[PDB]
Design a protein around this ligand. Sequence first.
Ligand SMILES: CC(=O)c1ccc[n+]([C@@H]2O[C@H](COP(=O)([O-])OP(=O)(O)OC[C@H]3O[C@@H](n4cnc5c(N)ncnc54)[C@H](O)[C@@H]3O)[C@@H](O)[C@H]2O)c1
Ligand SMILES: CC(=O)c1ccc[n+]([C@@H]2O[C@H](COP(=O)([O-])OP(=O)(O)OC[C@H]3O[C@@H](n4cnc5c(N)ncnc54)[C@H](O)[C@@H]3O)[C@@H](O)[C@H]2O)c1
Ligand SMILES: CC(=O)c1ccc[n+]([C@@H]2O[C@H](COP(=O)([O-])OP(=O)(O)OC[C@H]3O[C@@H](n4cnc5c(N)ncnc54)[C@H](O)[C@@H]3O)[C@@H](O)[C@H]2O)c1
Ligand SMILES: CC(=O)c1ccc[n+]([C@@H]2O[C@H](COP(=O)([O-])OP(=O)(O)OC[C@H]3O[C@@H](n4cnc5c(N)ncnc54)[C@H](O)[C@@H]3O)[C@@H](O)[C@H]2O)c1
Lengths: 317, 317, 317, 317
Amino acid sequence: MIERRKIAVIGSGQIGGNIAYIVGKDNLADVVLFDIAEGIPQGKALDITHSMVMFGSTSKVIGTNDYADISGSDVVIITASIPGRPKDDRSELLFGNARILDSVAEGVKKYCPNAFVICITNPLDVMVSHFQKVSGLPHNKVCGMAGVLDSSRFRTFIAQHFGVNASDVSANVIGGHGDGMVPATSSVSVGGVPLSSFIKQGLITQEQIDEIVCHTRIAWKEVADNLKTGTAYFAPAAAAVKMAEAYLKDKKAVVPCSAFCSNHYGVKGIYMGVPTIIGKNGVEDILELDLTPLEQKLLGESINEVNTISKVLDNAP
Amino acid sequence: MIERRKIAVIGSGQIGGNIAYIVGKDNLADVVLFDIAEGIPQGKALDITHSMVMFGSTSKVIGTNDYADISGSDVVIITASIPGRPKDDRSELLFGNARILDSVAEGVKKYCPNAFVICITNPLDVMVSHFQKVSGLPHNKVCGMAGVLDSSRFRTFIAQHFGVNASDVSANVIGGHGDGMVPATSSVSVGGVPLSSFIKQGLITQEQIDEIVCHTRIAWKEVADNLKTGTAYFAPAAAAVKMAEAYLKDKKAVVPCSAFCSNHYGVKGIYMGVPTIIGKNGVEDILELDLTPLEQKLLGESINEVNTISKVLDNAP
Amino acid sequence: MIERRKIAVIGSGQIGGNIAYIVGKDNLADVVLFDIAEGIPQGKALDITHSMVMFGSTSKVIGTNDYADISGSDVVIITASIPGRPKDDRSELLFGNARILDSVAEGVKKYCPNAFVICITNPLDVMVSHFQKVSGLPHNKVCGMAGVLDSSRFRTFIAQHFGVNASDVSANVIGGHGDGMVPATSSVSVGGVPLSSFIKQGLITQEQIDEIVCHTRIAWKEVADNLKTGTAYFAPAAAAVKMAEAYLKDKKAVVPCSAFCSNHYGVKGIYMGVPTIIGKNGVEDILELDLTPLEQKLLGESINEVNTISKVLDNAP
Amino acid sequence: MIERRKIAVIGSGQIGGNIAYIVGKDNLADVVLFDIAEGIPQGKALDITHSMVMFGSTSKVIGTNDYADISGSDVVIITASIPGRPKDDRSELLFGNARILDSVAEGVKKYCPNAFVICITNPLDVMVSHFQKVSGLPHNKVCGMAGVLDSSRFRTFIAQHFGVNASDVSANVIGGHGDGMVPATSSVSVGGVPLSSFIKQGLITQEQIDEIVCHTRIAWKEVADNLKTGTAYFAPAAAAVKMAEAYLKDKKAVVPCSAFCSNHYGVKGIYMGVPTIIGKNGVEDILELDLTPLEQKLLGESINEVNTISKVLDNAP
Ligand SMILES: CC(=O)c1ccc[n+]([C@@H]2O[C@H](COP(=O)([O-])OP(=O)(O)OC[C@H]3O[C@@H](n4cnc5c(N)ncnc54)[C@H](O)[C@@H]3O)[C@@H](O)[C@H]2O)c1
Ligand SMILES: CC(=O)c1ccc[n+]([C@@H]2O[C@H](COP(=O)([O-])OP(=O)(O)OC[C@H]3O[C@@H](n4cnc5c(N)ncnc54)[C@H](O)[C@@H]3O)[C@@H](O)[C@H]2O)c1
Ligand SMILES: CC(=O)c1ccc[n+]([C@@H]2O[C@H](COP(=O)([O-])OP(=O)(O)OC[C@H]3O[C@@H](n4cnc5c(N)ncnc54)[C@H](O)[C@@H]3O)[C@@H](O)[C@H]2O)c1
Ligand SMILES: CC(=O)c1ccc[n+]([C@@H]2O[C@H](COP(=O)([O-])OP(=O)(O)OC[C@H]3O[C@@H](n4cnc5c(N)ncnc54)[C@H](O)[C@@H]3O)[C@@H](O)[C@H]2O)c1
């Protein structure tokens, strides 16, 4: 007896609504939009439902305030957050969002403990770790969306320099989703050609590469300062869907995401951005990039950044 | 020498952003997001740009406040509007949006007069008529999105009663996009079966049909009352994209939309909801539904409402 | 634990290979190409496998001669047939293909008795009935591909007359997949407009409608006589995939197909072409079209045709 | 005034039919299937036409034997060939196909000289060179499909070893489409990780890499030996469509193909497999891979094989 695939979206704000829209459009799964705010998920679900016939999709999209309705969810995507964008740092949301995730963890533990959980709520890496701890779900079934967004920005900026299809740029961002994130320039390639070759050919300079690295790191503020009323939500939504696809279709896709890293990158059990393989069993493996000594040091500094914010949370009021 | 297809989105609010998102996802065309509001179109364009690699699309999406950037646009979709939802009737936005569309009309007339123009700005039918007059574009190259949304809702509600795929329901809403809209029950079919047969078979009652017709007419309020911030925007965006697809791909698709009807439905030159054929020459034809006497009367009342609101706009200092 | 969807294609000839190609392209499921001929399914599977990366699909496609490899198949599509096209009638393959289906039934019964079975092997309606009888699978889990092909041809020919998108033509063919098939002109509509209206408007004649009906009935020979080496295989393959999609995605799609009809169309338990609803439980309902007295008589003659060939099979040597 | 995109397929055999099928399914363009064989292109075009409504596509697909019907074609894909698979080497088809391409060249030169031409006919690299000379079309508007197929096989085999999505493997095959083809192991990456790292990590041996390289070179025989009727045709068709997409959508995609290389890889005007950038102006650029001394030597041997076979064609009565 085949059953419809089911994705629960916890938090039906800017990102949550976009996820439902795209999931429905692709007919990837049925969607349950959950929110504590009255009307919001219901209104978005009805609106998106009307669009399904236009897209030729038979996906069902419903809005709810009841955790019983996320029962049997294959994937749970957590977007729930306290209101207002971060001013200077994503960690400003730490204390409030940790408390939200405590409640979300109780819902998931009760109604869909076998779900693959994708966290989006900031500060991403610490929130993922917090959710895994309080929910008690297996490490391989809990991860955070970040690397796909960061790497997509990184790839896009490289692609825009060379004037080529971004899909043909290979580029990874690793470490914590913050100022310390590490766009690994050493393993960048465009159609198989490394950046070192493009430098020799005079088609890109190291300063231009440095600018692209900086642009990747500050990209969230560039979008946020232009939108004014909030942070990015079109690309983060799409990134989460790509991760959900990898799980639901058992793709064995290489997905940069915040995952529990135990025998790689010199760490012994920490949630941080790494290249994973995602399939039907969740996070099934982690790949080891060839990092330069400089990149290894920058990754070390990112790890310190993650541990620092994590310790602040451990000593929360 | 083939050129990239180009869609201009005038107004980068709730609907405009979704249009850019979906157009980019489908790689239907490049997108220019235009708005007078500072930052907004630029922020959304950058955000959506980051998602393009995630979707495997090479569409370019840019934000601007300069009408020179919509030059060479194949399609122009107008969402520009004064802020705030209508309380009781869509015609509350009449005067403000009429003035807005004057500026849009001069922009299109100057920089892309050969564009196919799809209006979304409310009050839809009168705004479409208004834009055509001030812009001077051919009647067949200017239309309004409404019928696709209304008909999609109608199809969805019928489908939900019978428990079937809405794509296999054929159903049209005609007349003005307002309370007087006419969900034509006489031409409803589900996989070839008409409603009259379903009544005889005992699978639906006339009362249930009446409820579906009413639901269709008031559907906009059901969404808006729940969103508690504005009107529907996921489905309206998708509908506009389907209309743009019909044009850009020369589909000869049957598209219910607000079009200039001059020799059908007992009218002699009025913009109202009718079943059109859309291809590379814009609105290429209008189909004549086999309406009952009751439906002809209801359509007459719709035409009166359109004329009434249109005359109020014509009579101003 | 989510598992990959799995389709078994029994017979890896012209149709079988196309099914695997399209299923793989859409990433609808993994495919097992089964055939008794050495090398054929293996070669096609390897070739199609190479294309998967080009389509961005992670579907696995393998070739085999072992029924153990169809274990756990969600859908089984039967294309197996004795060599050579029919000269004048599809029933020429009756005796040989009945024997093939005996063997296929033993494989399915042993390794995937819960599979949804879609028969393509001709003569279609009698082969479907034969397979259900010998396999012992539930009536609702065994059906034949025919109506989607016949109706698609019917819709296409109508669409080509009016110069419109065929997707906007509603048209059904019912009865046995043979000379007696009944293209139901009475329930044809183009964007909601019935043929009777187009006749009054002077846009189509009854003779032109009769030609389209005739063309639909003889379409198989038109393709076959041009191909020379066999019968149609691109459209029949696509039709089967649409049916597989409806089941796997639980679409509740209206699908004309050869199904067990017990309380509709004046029959009390016969496999013939009817409009069905297909979902996760297979054939879940049958819709009753509004047939004219003439159409009811033609359907009666089709039923006689089906019973005649069925009785020939019952008295096979 | 936008026009429908148009692809001409010259030769409606195994590959040509699949190209038409997929192009139509994707609604990438209208298709003209050309062949000298009576009935074949007409039969396939009619068959594929019936499937268009099933796929929700409005692409027109027609069959012909008249070069006047390829007038205004944006892309021309040449599959025309003498019958029968090669026994040991692709160059066995040299003289017969050279004469065939003479007639195709005069057709294209007369009716669509501004078309982007993608050759598939073997022996690929020499046939591409031959067509360019006799047709007189710009070097950048004529290329051959090979690299996409060879690289796709290479990527697939690498992906199968590591158990990952082949889409996340970056890998190039360069040089002539023959035994001398060079799967460039030095620029292989899996999610950013190079093969040298995988060796150090103990996840692959040099012997396994050598096997993959060999498998890639002989892959055509593995398929052909199993098909027992001709050569591969599902993947070659898909590859040609991906190249047509890059052109028609102006993707600026990195496409390994047989292109006119005049200032890269130590050659001064030869058609061979190289990583190109394809957009609306055809072959717009060629990327320079960072090849090892061994790979440079292997590429030199490939260039010799191409020159050898090319000289045999030049020397004829
Ligand atoms: C990691 C990354 O790249 C990235 C990118 C963009 C946004 N984000 C984060 O994603 C989160 C959501 O962003 P957004 O969608 O724009 O925010 P927003 O539009 O404010 O939506 C948040 C939603 O959460 C709802 N909510 C609040 N409390 C609860 C609760 N206890 N249970 C369920 N729902 C609740 C709330 O009603 C609102 O609809 C924020 O924390 C962002 O910082 C992360
Ligand atoms: C016909 C139909 O079915 C339907 C459905 C939903 C919404 N609508 C209408 O569509 C319109 C837009 O809806 P929305 O996107 O939710 O509204 P909203 O999110 O407010 O977006 C409107 C945008 O227009 C911009 N704008 C204002 N003045 C100008 C100007 N002179 N030039 C260019 N841009 C300007 C403004 O900055 C804002 O970003 C409204 O009038 C709605 O009533 C129609
Ligand atoms: C209903 C409808 O619309 C329609 C349309 C087109 C074709 N068909 C029928 O579909 C069938 C297949 O057509 P095709 O693919 O062109 O035919 P073809 O290309 O000959 O393929 C038939 C395949 O079946 C294989 N086969 C033979 N015996 C067995 C067996 N015992 N077990 C497993 N495999 C076996 C055989 O090796 C061959 O590869 C024929 O019976 C056609 O008449 C039906
Ligand atoms: C480069 C590469 O990777 C690759 C892969 C697979 C096949 N191929 C080649 O592609 C070619 C076609 O393969 P196929 O489709 O399997 O072969 P096949 O199925 O025989 O089709 C060839 C078609 O060309 C037609 N034809 C013959 N002469 C002419 C002419 N003068 N004008 C127009 N059409 C003509 C002929 O009627 C036939 O339908 C062969 O040469 C293969 O070797 C190349």
